Design a protein around this ligand. Structure first.
Ligand code: B1A
Ligand code: NAG
Length: 341
């Protein structure tokens, strides 16, 4: 169990003005810190944010959150469930800003909702320093789905924040799970354009300077923002991601046209990861992995994801028998026998 703390700075809020927060299970004898960003799509105008407030309210408000959460997968403290970082300090940051962790806009006079995801991350880090993060030696910012994209948008800002607060020794790293999407041709972009204006969304400065005014939406796509990043980032992406296929209007007797479409999507995803040295990409139809209890089961080329992450740690201190770049080459879903059932 991780226990809830609402933010002491109550001006940093969820969508409806209620305080944001974080769940914490500390580990005294450890100097490693894992901050996990929850996912859950997003909303981009008044009417579809209102819809989300009726039937997905816990993603927009803290008024109904429980006092405790169970840590699962990489947030588990048990070595059998979490061979990678079972002894670490564990933090789960709930997603209640509906802005892919990019917003910096208060509730107001002219704003029905607050979109403060980027400021929520910054405030959690600030308040955690007084609870032991000041002694840390590695801070891993991780996340799944919209939280995975949020890692890409925020990892360098967290590094910059700690450097300016006087903590140059804390090594900030990123782990982006299922947040690496393609702006490809559909089988049969305005939502994100149109949300960044609604959220006052912020993107990393170097990527902003490449694409410039009005084109910041480009920085929500992994293969375009990752080359501008400076912190080390490990990328986990299923080759046949279910969220990707949904937006592409694919619904799984597959005939030639769809066969080529699916095979092409795989090969395109594979291509965008060829120059990503730390990555894990199985040939499976799925979505998210790192906080699932059975995340230890999947393997690429004989290496599991917890092992690949351990090899990543060793690389940041070629390694014999301990690889870090693991991308499937077989071209159809399920062609890896270890895929989730
Ligand atoms: C031609 C063109 O613009 N294609 C395109 C653009 C944006 C998306 N957006 C998206 C992808 C995956 C997951 C969530 C959103 C998908 C396809
Ligand atoms: C609380 O957060 C807001 C928004 O980030 C900031 O402007 C304000 O200075 C913060 N208050 C304190 C006491 O840090």
């Amino acid at each position: 169990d991780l226990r809830l703390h609402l933010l002491l700075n109550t001006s940093v809020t969820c969508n409806d003005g209620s305080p944001a927060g974080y769940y914490l299970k500390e580990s005294r004898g450890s100097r490693r810190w894992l901050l996990f960003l929850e996912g859950g799509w997003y909303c981009f105008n008044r009417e579809n944010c209102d819809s989300r407030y009726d039937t997905m309210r816990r993603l927009m408000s803290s008024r109904d959150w429980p006092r405790t959460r169970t840590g699962t997968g990489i947030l588990s403290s048990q070595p059998e469930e979490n061979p990678y970082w079972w002894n670490a300090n564990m933090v789960f940051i709930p997603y209640c800003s509906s802005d892919v962790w990019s917003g910096a806009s208060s509730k107001s006079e002219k704003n029905e909702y607050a979109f403060m995801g980027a400021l929520i991350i910054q405030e959690v880090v600030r308040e955690l320093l007084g609870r032991g993060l000041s002694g840390a030696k590695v801070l891993l910012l991780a996340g799944s789905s919209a939280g995975g994209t949020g890692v890409l948008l925020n990892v360098d800002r967290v590094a910059e924040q700690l450097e300016k607060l006087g903590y140059p020794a804390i090594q900030v790293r990123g782990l982006a799970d299922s947040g690496w999407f393609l702006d490809n041709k559909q089988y049969r972009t305005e939502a994100i354009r149109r949300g960044i204006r609604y959220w006052n969304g912020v993107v990393p400065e170097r990527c902003r300077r490449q694409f410039q005014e009005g084109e910041e939406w480009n920085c929500f796509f992994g293969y375009k923002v990752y080359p501008t990043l400076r912190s080390p980032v490990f990328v986990v992406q299923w080759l046949f991601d279910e969220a990707q296929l949904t937006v592409d209007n694919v619904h799984l007797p597959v005939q030639e046209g769809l066969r080529l479409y699916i095979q092409n999507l795989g090969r395109e995803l594979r291509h965008t990861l060829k120059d990503v040295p730390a990555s894990f990409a199985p040939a499976c139809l799925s979505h998210e992995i790192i906080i699932r209890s059975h995340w230890t089961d999947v393997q690429v080329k004989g290496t599991s994801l917890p092992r690949a992450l351990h090899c990543w740690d060793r690389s940041l201190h070629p390694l014999k028998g301990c690889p870090v770049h693991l991308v499937d080459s077989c071209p159809w879903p399920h062609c890896n026998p270890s895929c989730p059932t």
